[PDB]
Enzyme design. Structure first.
Site, PDB file in Angstrom:
ATOM      1  N   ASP A   8      36.932  41.669  45.795  1.00 27.86           N
ATOM      2  CA  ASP A   8      37.326  40.798  44.701  1.00 27.86           C
ATOM      3  C   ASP A   8      36.341  41.017  43.540  1.00 27.86           C
ATOM      4  O   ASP A   8      35.220  41.535  43.733  1.00 27.86           O
ATOM      5  CB  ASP A   8      37.305  39.356  45.195  1.00 27.86           C
ATOM      6  N   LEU A   9      36.727  40.613  42.327  1.00 25.85           N
ATOM      7  CA  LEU A   9      35.799  40.742  41.201  1.00 25.85           C
ATOM      8  C   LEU A   9      35.213  39.378  40.792  1.00 25.85           C
ATOM      9  O   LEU A   9      34.000  39.157  40.921  1.00 25.85           O
ATOM     10  CB  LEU A   9      36.461  41.420  39.982  1.00 25.85           C
ATOM     11  N   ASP A  10      36.057  38.474  40.310  1.00 29.69           N
ATOM     12  CA  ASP A  10      35.555  37.234  39.755  1.00 29.69           C
ATOM     13  C   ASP A  10      34.900  36.365  40.838  1.00 29.69           C
ATOM     14  O   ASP A  10      35.545  35.976  41.813  1.00 29.69           O
ATOM     15  CB  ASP A  10      36.691  36.454  39.060  1.00 29.69           C
ATOM     16  N   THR A  16      32.241  35.651  36.569  1.00 28.23           N
ATOM     17  CA  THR A  16      33.388  35.399  35.712  1.00 28.23           C
ATOM     18  C   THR A  16      34.326  34.292  36.262  1.00 28.23           C
ATOM     19  O   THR A  16      35.172  33.767  35.519  1.00 28.23           O
ATOM     20  CB  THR A  16      34.179  36.673  35.462  1.00 28.23           C
ATOM     21  N   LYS A  45      40.845  29.755  42.018  1.00 28.23           N
ATOM     22  CA  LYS A  45      40.102  30.972  42.303  1.00 28.23           C
ATOM     23  C   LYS A  45      40.968  31.957  43.084  1.00 28.23           C
ATOM     24  O   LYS A  45      41.547  31.609  44.092  1.00 28.23           O
ATOM     25  CB  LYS A  45      38.830  30.654  43.082  1.00 28.23           C
ATOM     26  N   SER A 111      41.282  42.829  42.942  1.00 27.20           N
ATOM     27  CA  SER A 111      41.208  41.675  42.054  1.00 27.20           C
ATOM     28  C   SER A 111      42.596  41.301  41.519  1.00 27.20           C
ATOM     29  O   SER A 111      43.392  42.173  41.221  1.00 27.20           O
ATOM     30  CB  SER A 111      40.312  42.015  40.873  1.00 27.20           C
ATOM     31  N   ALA A 112      42.866  40.005  41.407  1.00 26.57           N
ATOM     32  CA  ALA A 112      44.068  39.521  40.727  1.00 26.57           C
ATOM     33  C   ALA A 112      44.107  39.845  39.242  1.00 26.57           C
ATOM     34  O   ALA A 112      45.152  39.681  38.608  1.00 26.57           O
ATOM     35  CB  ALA A 112      44.154  38.022  40.875  1.00 26.57           C
ATOM     36  N   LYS A 142      47.577  36.832  45.787  1.00 27.30           N
ATOM     37  CA  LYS A 142      46.832  36.016  46.734  1.00 27.30           C
ATOM     38  C   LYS A 142      47.389  34.610  46.734  1.00 27.30           C
ATOM     39  O   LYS A 142      47.638  34.062  45.645  1.00 27.30           O
ATOM     40  CB  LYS A 142      45.347  36.009  46.389  1.00 27.30           C
ATOM     41  N   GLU A 166      35.097  38.112  49.220  1.00 23.55           N
ATOM     42  CA  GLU A 166      35.832  37.113  48.429  1.00 23.55           C
ATOM     43  C   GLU A 166      35.014  35.842  48.272  1.00 23.55           C
ATOM     44  O   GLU A 166      34.182  35.510  49.121  1.00 23.55           O
ATOM     45  CB  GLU A 166      37.140  36.757  49.130  1.00 23.55           C
ATOM     46  N   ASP A 167      35.279  35.137  47.172  1.00 21.27           N
ATOM     47  CA  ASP A 167      34.678  33.836  46.873  1.00 21.27           C
ATOM     48  C   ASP A 167      35.707  32.716  46.888  1.00 21.27           C
ATOM     49  O   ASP A 167      35.364  31.591  46.522  1.00 21.27           O
ATOM     50  CB  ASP A 167      34.018  33.829  45.477  1.00 21.27           C
TER      51      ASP A 167
HETATM   52  O1  LIG Z   1      42.352  37.585  34.514  1.00 13.78           O
HETATM   53  P1  LIG Z   1      43.787  37.288  34.759  1.00 13.78           P
HETATM   54  O2  LIG Z   1      44.270  36.070  34.060  1.00 13.78           O
HETATM   55  O3  LIG Z   1      44.701  38.430  34.727  1.00 13.78           O
HETATM   56  C1  LIG Z   1      43.850  36.797  36.514  1.00 13.78           C
HETATM   57  F1  LIG Z   1      45.171  36.356  36.844  1.00 13.78           F
HETATM   58  C2  LIG Z   1      42.874  35.697  36.950  1.00 13.78           C
HETATM   59  O4  LIG Z   1      42.410  36.023  38.227  1.00 13.78           O
HETATM   60  C3  LIG Z   1      41.417  35.108  38.747  1.00 13.78           C
HETATM   61  C4  LIG Z   1      40.983  35.660  40.103  1.00 13.78           C
HETATM   62  O5  LIG Z   1      40.440  37.010  39.923  1.00 13.78           O
HETATM   63  C5  LIG Z   1      41.967  33.708  38.848  1.00 13.78           C
HETATM   64  O6  LIG Z   1      40.916  32.878  39.371  1.00 13.78           O
HETATM   65  C6  LIG Z   1      42.343  33.289  37.445  1.00 13.78           C
HETATM   66  O7  LIG Z   1      42.876  31.935  37.532  1.00 13.78           O
HETATM   67  C7  LIG Z   1      43.379  34.205  36.858  1.00 13.78           C
HETATM   68  O8  LIG Z   1      43.748  33.794  35.518  1.00 13.78           O
HETATM   69 MG   LIG Z   2      37.195  35.564  43.023  1.00 13.08          MG
END
Ligand SMILES: O=P(O)(O)[C@H](F)[C@@H]1O[C@H](CO)[C@@H](O)[C@H](O)[C@H]1O
Ligand SMILES: [Mg+2]
Length: 215
Positions: A8-10, A16, A45, A111-112, A142, A166-167
Site C-alpha cells: 500500500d502507499l498512503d 499521505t 483508509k 495502492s487505491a 479494497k 497495509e495501514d
Molecule cells: O488518491 P485517490 O483519490 O485516487 C484514492 F482513491 C484514495 O486512496 C486512499 C487509499 O490509498 C483512500 O484512503 C482515499 O480515501 C482515496 O481518495
Molecule cells: Mg493506506
C-alpha cells in the site's frame, strides 16, 4: 521464502493518509457533514475515491454534484502533496526497498490511489518498484482482493508467496482474501489482534518480514 512484497502507499510508504483525511474532512464540512473524524476516517483508509465519498454522503446529491465533489477533494489533495519529497518517506521504507532488491524479492505497488505514481516520483522511489498495479484496471477495489492479486501477478509471483503491507481495515481484508500474508502498521485497536501489527514502519525490516514468514 516469500518472493514479493505488495505495498500500500498512503500510510505505509509515507504519511499521505493524513492528507487524505484532512481533505475529506474539509469537503464533508463544506457540505454540512461533520462526522468525518479520525475514527470515521478508519473507514476511508484504503477505500476508492468514489466509495470514500459515498461513505461520507451516507451520513442525497445529484450525479453532477457527486462528480464535482470527488474532483474538488482530489484537486485539494493534489495541491496538498506538491511539496512531498524523499525526506517524507517513512522510516525503514527506503532501506526495506534496497534490501528487498538485493535479495531478489519483487516489489509491487497495490495502492487505491491514482496519485500513486506521482507520489513515488516525488519521493524518488519509482525505480525500486518492479510493478505498479493500476487501480483503474481492477474490476473491484479494497476490501476486495483484486488489487493485491493484480500486484502479485504483475511481478510473476503467487499471492500465497507474497507479503502485503497495509495501514487500513479495508486493505488488511483485501490482503487476507488474496492469499498473501498481511503485516499491518498502526494500532491494534484499529486494525485487529488476529494478524501481525507493528506500531510504526521502522519495524518493517527484511529481518522482521523473514521472522514473521518463518513463524
Ligand atoms: O488518491 P485517490 O483519490 O485516487 C484514492 F482513491 C484514495 O486512496 C486512499 C487509499 O490509498 C483512500 O484512503 C482515499 O480515501 C482515496 O481518495
Ligand atoms: Mg493506506
Amino acid at each position: 521464502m516469500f518472493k514479493a512484497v505488495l505495498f500500500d502507499l498512503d500510510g505505509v510508504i509515507t504519511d499521505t493518509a493524513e492528507y487524505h483525511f484532512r481533505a475529506w474532512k474539509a469537503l464533508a464540512e463544506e457540505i454540512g457533514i461533520n462526522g468525518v473524524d479520525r475514527q470515521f476516517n478508519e473507514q476511508l483508509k484504503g477505500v476508492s475515491r468514489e466509495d470514500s465519498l459515498q461513505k461520507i454522503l451516507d451520513l442525497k446529491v445529484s450525479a453532477e454534484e457527486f462528480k464535482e465533489l470527488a474532483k474538488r477533494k482530489n484537486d485539494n489533495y493534489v495541491k496538498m502533496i506538491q511539496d512531498v519529497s524523499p525526506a517524507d518517506v517513512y522510516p525503514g521504507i527506503l532501506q526495506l526497498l534496497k534490501d528487498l532488491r538485493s535479495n531478489k524479492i519483487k516489489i509491487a505497488l497495490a495502492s487505491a490511489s491514482k496519485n500513486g505514481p506521482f507520489l513515488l516520483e516525488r519521493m524518488n522511489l519509482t525505480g525500486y518498484f518492479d510493478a505498479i498495479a493500476d487501480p483503474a484496471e481492477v474490476a473491484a477495489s479494497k476490501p476486495a482482493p483484486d488489487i493485491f492479486i493484480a500486484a502479485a501477478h504483475a511481478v510473476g509471483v503467487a499471492p500465497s508467496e507474497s507479503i502485503g503491507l497495509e495501514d487500513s481495515q479495508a486493505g488488511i481484508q483485501a490482503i487476507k482474501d488474496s492469499g498473501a500474508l498481511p503485516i499491518g502498521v498502526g494500532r491494534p485497536e484499529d486494525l485487529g489482534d488476529d494478524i501481525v501489527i507493528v506500531p510504526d514502519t521502522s519495524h518493517y525490516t527484511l529481518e522482521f518480514l523473514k521472522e514473521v514468514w518463518l513463524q
